[PDB]
Write a protein that binds this ligand. Structure first.
Ligand SMILES: CCCCCCN(CC[C@H](N)C(=O)O)C[C@H]1O[C@@H](n2cnc3c(N)ncnc32)[C@H](O)[C@@H]1O
Length: 246
């Protein structure tokens, strides 16, 4: 009446790894909707689409073009590439083993390693700064007991994830033609690495490890990482180890 007259809120959840969830939350404050997005650590590559409580139901490849007062504008990338939360188990590595991670695909590729008799290695596509997430280490999730209690000829692709879980990429998935959803396992070992394994929360893969650079790397530099066995360990390692003090 006798008073002057006149005539919604976006939320960002950042992970320690630099990735993030973004959208409007529902009445209960959960990331639920069809306009929710996950944003890779480059803060431009995105998976936009349907999410229930932060879990990706249907993420379409997208680019974060700009942000205005916390409100992100997304723009769909060309194609039919869609992604969903697809956490592996102890026997299922992926529901779409041949569906590449789009972020990884821009940064790494697999070629023959420069380290002799190392096999294949992982290489960069891009000159980047230190601390750049480059690649993802996904695989099946088996316990420390199963791993530790079997031969070393089975553990060439095992990477401890935490106190409870080891990640493995077992036969035939060590072949790029059978599994290329993630490529972290293609990085060979150096006692003078340019990367580390690091924690990562992936919208498709769940909690896993990634390869993150320790420093600047050139386009086409081989990406290496210290495997970190205890001082037991495979022969080539034990051999490379002793052949390093010099
Ligand atoms: C705990 C870390 C888990 C990820 C390791 C996976 N692979 C690397 C990928 C392998 N080049 C391949 O083409 O599937 C390691 C295998 O590659 C060779 N390799 C890795 N680094 C090497 C080095 N510095 N020297 C010789 N051989 C090496 C050995 O045959 C390993 O079993």
């Amino acid at each position: 009446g006798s008073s002057g007259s006149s005539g919604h809120g976006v939320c960002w959840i950042y992970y320690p790894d630099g990735g993030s969830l973004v959208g409007e939350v529902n009445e209960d404050g959960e990331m639920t909707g069809e306009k929710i997005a996950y944003v890779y650590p480059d803060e431009r590559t995105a998976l936009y689409g349907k999410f229930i409580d932060g879990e990706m139901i249907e993420g379409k490849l997208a680019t974060l073009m700009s942000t205005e007062e916390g409100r992100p504008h997304f723009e769909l990338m060309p194609g039919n590439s869609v992604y969903h939360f697809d956490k592996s188990t102890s026997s299922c590595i992926s529901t779409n083993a041949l569906l590449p991670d789009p972020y990884e695909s821009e940064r790494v590729y697999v070629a023959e390693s420069l380290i002799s008799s190392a096999g294949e290695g992982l290489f960069s596509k891009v000159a980047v700064g230190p601390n750049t997430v480059m690649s993802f280490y996904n695989g099946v999730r088996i316990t420390h007991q199963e791993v530790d209690s079997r031969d070393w000829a089975l553990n060439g692709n095992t990477l401890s994830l935490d106190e409870e879980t080891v990640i493995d990429v077992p036969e035939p998935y060590n072949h790029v033609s059978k599994y290329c959803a993630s490529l972290g396992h293609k990085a060979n070992h150096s006692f003078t690495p340019n990367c580390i394994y690091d924690m990562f929360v992936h919208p498709r893969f769940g909690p896993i490890k990634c390869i993150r650079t320790l420093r600047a790397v050139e386009a086409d530099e081989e990406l290496t990482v210290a495997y970190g066995y205890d001082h037991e360990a495979p022969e080539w390692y034990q051999v490379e180890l002793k052949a390093f003090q010099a």
